[PDB]
Design a protein around this ligand. Structure first.
Ligand SMILES: CCCCCCCC/C=C\CCCCCCCC(=O)O[C@H](COC(=O)CCCCCCCCCCCCCCC)COP(=O)([O-])OCC[N+](C)(C)C
Ligand SMILES: CC(C)C(=O)OC[C@H]1O[C@@H](n2ccc(NO)nc2=O)[C@H](O)[C@@H]1O
Ligand SMILES: CC(C)C(=O)OC[C@H]1O[C@@H](n2ccc(NO)nc2=O)[C@H](O)[C@@H]1O
Ligand SMILES: CC(C)C(=O)OC[C@H]1O[C@@H](n2ccc(NO)nc2=O)[C@H](O)[C@@H]1O
Lengths: 521, 533, 533
């Protein structure tokens, strides 16, 4: 094999140039594919052209910023110095302008809609105050994230509710995510037989976790996910104090489940601070997944309201995490692709078992609590006593503060009780039943039991229920997070209940703002 | 800012008094609620009133006993001194009186009942004698634990089986255990859908283990379980005279599985002697766990007999271990060290729940895989036996036919009559080679056949057996001693104390036989007390 | 006490005689049973008489070989010496005669069979040359194991395929294995209910794995599989001349999986050379286990071809390993040490069964989860490919429409005709990227389509392929070489021998390619001997 050795030496002589040539050949082939697709039919080939243009623009921008960083920094430094010099009096001007804008908005927009929106605004203020009062570290609170989150959720709500173009983009993104999950559905269909839909959770919801684990492992190996995390971290750090990890988690949870989303930042989980872990859990508890979203738009719940609530939850989750548990402490392996995929698979084999077992145990305990309450009520002539009715009676003032008129406070409180102590699936079933009763028509009160509730109360209830804040969710979150990062086990269980409460309050805040904006048609 | 800090400091200054007052106010409010419930309608509120009275009495009793232990010991000392002084001649009188009482009770009661009761008593004597003969150190035997264990079993059986209020009380306790464990379906149905019943075993029976493990972890963290364990262990320690560590483990094994029982004394596990380790393994084998009790009651097995079997099996295991592998060396664990139990790592409730749930994972996985393998082996064995027996004009030959003749003498000695001893032998064989779940399934089928009625002999094959034989079989099957389950238990124990690995395997096989003999002793006593239909 | 010790000592003195008497009595009883069965009805007792006769013959043969090995070696030595003396000129004559015989066979048989068989032989030559070229050490290649492996494969294929009694024997064995695993399929109904057929894969295919693992551990404890492995390994070692460890491993994979086969030489894994480690990996990747044999035969795959491929894969595996990665260092493992296989440490048979059952859990879990992930990725890939192809007015583009063209040359060289090479190419692609289960499923569907009948071409798409192509595809797919399994093998083997980790990851992909080439060689040899329908 003298010839083989000579050829190997020759290739090694021009190894870099050979690699550059082959990569250039592949790039030329991809560009030829794009150009041919455009030639045959441009409208048909438009998405591939747009994707290619965005990718090439990002590559060029990154290279240019890396090369010309010195000149850009030197040019920008004087502006930063000037801003630092004049901040002392400029902060007052900015705050005054913002207060003036809020006053104008209340005067011209909300006052015209009706009196019920001012109550929504009052509720918003009350909720913020209460969250600050019971915060873990009241003194060490950073108010910039909170105000930015409230303002951002307000703007996004106004961008999705008032304008159709804003609606279209988020609809498109949701469709893409659901289409993505359909693939794990197909794999599970093969492995568990065609009758896998008989056992929905066990044979459908967990294969999603397996597939997402696999893909995320591969994407961390390739290096795209770290680029995404860097870009998101930078933009969010300029716009808010939020750190990159929790910002990315919160953005991901908009369309991804609570159990899947922490896999976005799995490598960083051991080294996150307590506040960032609390923010991760809270962001998980205050959003719903994609498949459930499809099933809820199927039941008859409005699609626009579900989408608006899902999008608005993330800023609200971040603001409530930063207020409820501020950050006092200072922050802070795959040889090839097949290794990435296989390691993802194995991590999944651990995760799924832990999740399932914890969920079983927690639901059993909750049912026992409810049955002991029913027994105690039976001894008092009121066997109907349970968690749901205690919430139907306790939650009425909060429901009224959210904006729903007094008459409909009871039904909204009961729905929130079902949602908190039973998955929001049953809560949305009840809500759709009430919507159907209203649409069919009939007497408002049969004898003394109300049948349905106004349209506006239905919208508020739709906003309030959009979240995975239950105790089964508590179980699956604890199990999954302890499987992902065993080192932080003692820390994960510490902030679980506060995370759950923060998630529920985030849902209530989104509902408060939505009621501030929406009006009965 | 500063005001909040000042308020926090002021609260901390009076933190103890304020917290005590608030907790007392909450307790008083609960008491007022109970009082109001009783006033409104006493009959409905009777359970809550009884629970409150019992809890108050036990709290007061524990507090007083802690307060005046020295005075109690001082008052007791003169009596102990006098008894020690006069024991030299009083021991013979006590022994003679005990022998006379035994003879009188045996003659009158048993001879009135029939011959099967006398046969069961003879079987008890035979089992004890055989255990004594095949003992590790027959010369170095200490008979006091043996006699006291047999006496405690007899007293428990006489108090439950022969007294109606006790029978009703234990039946009620079993019903409550079943009802409590039935709540696992709330989670099983959610996780596995409403069709979870379609796969009965996998999506009903296994989740019960998960729920029980979580509940026991929570109770161990809180400290309710340790209270009962300490009390029963103290009773056994004072009566029989066993060592504190083995007494605590045997008392715990009543309602805790064999795998999780030694975790109570894990910190001191390396320092146990050989005899104590053998007793630990035996007490683990002889008794069943609390999780399986609900499932077995569901099949139709009597709850009173299950509960009585567990309670009587604890002292059975201890006495048989002391007779079978007597201790020949000085123990190294103090009573205070043994009794004290400290949570491994549970700062808050959620951590305890999560830890129990996580352990149930491996438990259930091993259980299911072993079941699959061993039932496949059973089917193959039956087919091969039938094929071999077809050669000799006997195609009915199977595993059951061999087992019925093999184990017949044990069933006959336990007190079962001649004709029914073969079916009990079949059950014993199923339990010995395969875990007791399948044996209990077969027993439930026989019980259902009896209850439904019909011909006792269809053509020439008996369909069901008497009620007394069913009670005896219930007692003789209440254990975890299996050939298949040996390996796992060894591994589990070896995980807790690797330093003792060489010792654990040495006494692993003999503990299984000791546990089976203990089960047979409990069954012998039950057969003696029960009366023929 | 003293009498008991004296009796124990006396029994210890005669312990060996007691064991010998017990074994003699058992043997006499078995012989008496066989005699009774034969005399009652020789027709019914034929199978048991045959089993007894073969068992006695093998026992006698083993005893004679063990006792008189020295005399046999003494007698054989002069002949070997004379052969070595004349070898200098005899080797040319033997080689020329062998080549002449090969040419005569080709001309007389293969040309008459048709052109496709000549193409199959050409493909055999092409595969051998291609493997030689891209070899780790082309200059240092030992050519004896290559020619001897090809010769043994040809001899075995000729014997089984071209002789009817041999063809019937392997069919009979396949049916017996079907029945043996059907026992497990029945035994899983208890755990997963009577509706386990609803979820075919998870609740039928995996219990087969568990039961096979249990049976394998049982047999390993007894010592039969070790006997068979020793005999086959000796047959291959006397001919080829490979090393002891690699011969034993490649001779014990015919029925053992890849993950568990190295346990045979687990103690010596850290001392194996790089070449022998590669041979172990290759023999792992080029054979299937016996657990999956039943399922594949049930789908409709021919049993004779499955068993013939399993048997032929081992010589091909070794020949390809020795061609691809020839040995350049002296092994340090003795033949006596390698052939020795330590029996299971299990105290009894049932402990071994439990150990195997507990071991199977990780294998089943990894299989399931890898299947889920990889099929999800396949669905995503197909969707993206169709989306891209829609832009060029070709939405039919997909993963299989690329595999058909990518792997076509390999199928064509194997001897398949032009028209049917694309379907075999799709099957090869499915087996390479995803496990052979899915490829065999597609093959079963095509065989069912052929058997049912109907139009050969319903449209411009072919429906089913010829019979000979089905046999060739049966041979080519009989392996465990997957991208998905490339990880698990490494993970297990590093667990067995951590010190060798750096070496294991070096020779994994080459081992996988060697396994695939071994499968293709078996397919070529099979296709050269199969006449067109
Ligand atoms: C849409 C949402 C409105 C977001 C503004 C909310 C007020 C934040 C005030 C604050 O403390 O941050 C300050 C000014 O924040 C700004 O950078 C200017 C914000 C006004 C421009 C909005 C268009 C900066 O916070 P700091 O550097 O920590 O001091
Ligand atoms: C029970 C099924 C049918 C259901 O949909 O009820 C909603 C509840 O099921 C959990 N859940 C659901 C979907 C998901 N990703 O798509 N992750 C989850 O955790 C979550 O607890 C929620 O409350
Ligand atoms: C499916 C279950 C109910 C069953 O059939 O049980 C048979 C085997 O399960 C072991 N087991 C069970 C429960 C437990 N704690 O609740 N500890 C144990 O060890 C025990 O060894 C026995 O042999
Ligand atoms: C569903 C099962 C039966 C199956 O089709 O298996 C596919 C993959 O599972 C690996 N496997 C399988 C069996 C075994 N011993 O019986 N050892 C293994 O490693 C092996 O990689 C193969 O590709």
């Amino acid at each position: 094999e003298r010839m083989c050795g000579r050829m190997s030496d020759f290739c090694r002589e021009h190894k870099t140039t050979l690699r550059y040539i082959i990569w250039g050949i592949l790039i030329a082939g991809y560009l030829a594919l794009v150009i041919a697709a455009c030639v045959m039919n441009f409208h048909r080939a438009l998405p591939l052209f747009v994707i290619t243009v965005v990718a090439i623009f990002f590559v060029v921008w990154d290279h240019l910023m890396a090369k010309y960083e010195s000149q850009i920094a030197r040019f920008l430094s004087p502006g930063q110095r000037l801003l630092d010099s004049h901040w002392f009096w400029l902060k007052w001007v900015i705050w005054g302008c913002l207060i003036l804008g809020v006053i104008l908005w209340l005067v011209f927009d909300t006052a015209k809609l009706g009196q019920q929106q001012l109550v929504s605004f009052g509720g918003l203020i009350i909720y913020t105050s209460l969250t600050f009062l019971f915060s873990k570290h009241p003194t060490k609170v950073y108010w910039r994230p909170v105000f930015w989150g409230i303002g951002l959720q307000f703007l996004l709500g106004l961008l999705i509710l008032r304008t159709e173009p804003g609606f279209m983009a988020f609809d498109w993104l949701g469709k893409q995510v659901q289409t993505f999950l359909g693939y794990s559905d197909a794999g599970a269909s093969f492995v568990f037989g065609e009758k896998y839909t008989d056992h929905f959770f066990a044979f459908k919801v967990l294969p999603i976790v397996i597939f997402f684990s696999t893909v995320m492992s591969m994407l961390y190996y390739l290096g795209l996910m770290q680029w995404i995390i860097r870009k998101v971290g930078w933009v969010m750090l300029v716009t808010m104090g939020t750190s990159p990890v929790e910002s990315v988690v919160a953005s991901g949870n908009i369309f991804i489940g609570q159990t899947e989303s922490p896999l976005l930042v799995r490598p960083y989980l051991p080294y996150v601070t307590k506040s960032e872990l609390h923010a991760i859990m809270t962001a998980g508890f205050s959003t719903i997944a994609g498949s459930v979203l499809g099933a809820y738009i199927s039941f008859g719940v409005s699609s626009s309201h579900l989408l608006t609530a899902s999008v608005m939850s993330a800023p609200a989750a971040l603001a409530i995490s930063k207020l409820f548990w501020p950050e006092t402490e200072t922050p802070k392996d795959s040889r090839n692709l097949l290794e990435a995929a296989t390691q993802g698979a194995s991590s999944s084999i651990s995760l799924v078992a832990n999740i399932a077992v914890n969920l079983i145990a927690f639901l059993a305990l909750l049912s026992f609590m409810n049955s002991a309450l029913s027994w105690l009520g039976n001894m008092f002539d009121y066997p109907q006593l349970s968690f749901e009715v205690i919430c139907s009676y306790v939650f009425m003032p909060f429901a009224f503060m959210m904006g729903v008129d007094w008459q409909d406070s009871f039904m909204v409180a009961k729905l929130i009780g079902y949602k908190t102590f039973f998955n929001e699936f049953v809560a949305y079933q009840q809500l759709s039943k009430l919507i159907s009763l209203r649409q069919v028509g009939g007497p408002k009160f049969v004898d003394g039991v109300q049948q349905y509730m106004s349209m506006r109360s239905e919208a508020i209830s739709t906003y309030a229920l959009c979240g995975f804040a239950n105790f089964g969710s508590l179980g699956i979150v604890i199990g999954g997070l302890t499987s992902m990062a065993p080192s932080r086990k003692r820390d994960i269980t510490a902030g679980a209940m506060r995370a759950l409460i923060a998630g529920t309050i985030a849902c209530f805040l989104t509902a408060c703002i939505a009621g501030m904006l929406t009006n009965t048609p």
